[PDB]
Design a protein around this ligand. Structure first.
Ligand code: SF4
Length: 184
């Protein structure tokens, strides 16, 4: 709880370790105060994979869904609380909900309008990727190298390139713990 909790996952320090997909999901949750089923599972199981406790997860999801008066606490407890508790097995279920790897993430149905699951290196446009990479302090030479892998369909190589360029197999939780390891 000292490192990963409901408040510290919104921190810049912790969130600077997220791969592009989790960053995309967190951003959609912050502005819409809600995520769809596929996006819910991708992000929820990742946070569980980095050590977010059951109590902190329910604190995290409840505040996020009810933020800015998006929905009441009663609507959340009646329409979403069970599903999040289900993912941690707090209702007695013994389904093995492991965090999704990149292969599993890319295999899900592709995101449409309003969806935030998936992998940005395949689902975003080159224009959207380029602007996002520039805010991450990448130069156009580095950008053209990442888009090259994207155009070739090697999305895990493009994400591995971003890691090396932003720092000094194929799993989003492996991205986090490698990056978070370089912080300590
Ligand atoms: S390669 Fe995997 S970890 Fe990286 S952005 Fe795509 S789905 Fe996320």
């Amino acid at each position: 709880d000292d490192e990963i909790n409901a408040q510290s996952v919104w921190s810049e320090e912790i969130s600077s370790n997220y791969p592009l997909c989790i960053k995309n999901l967190m951003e959609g949750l912050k502005k819409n105060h809600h995520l769809r089923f596929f996006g819910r599972q991708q992000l929820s199981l990742f946070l569980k994979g980095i050590g977010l406790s059951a109590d902190e997860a329910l604190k995290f999801w409840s505040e996020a869904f009810t933020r800015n008066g998006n929905m009441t606490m009663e609507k959340f407890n009646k329409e979403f609380r069970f599903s999040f508790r289900h993912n941690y097995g707090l209702e007695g279920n013994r389904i093995n909900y492991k965090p999704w790897d990149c292969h599993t993430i890319l295999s899900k149905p592709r995101p449409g309008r309003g969806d935030f699951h998936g992998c940005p290196f395949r689902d975003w446009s080159h224009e959207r990727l380029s602007a996002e990479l520039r805010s991450m302090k990448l130069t156009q030479a580095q950008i053209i190298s990442v888009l090259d892998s994207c155009q070739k369909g090697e999305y895990t190589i493009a994400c591995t390139k971003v890691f090396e360029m932003t720092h000094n197999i194929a799993h989003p939780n492996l991205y986090f713990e490698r990056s978070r390891q370089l912080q300590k």
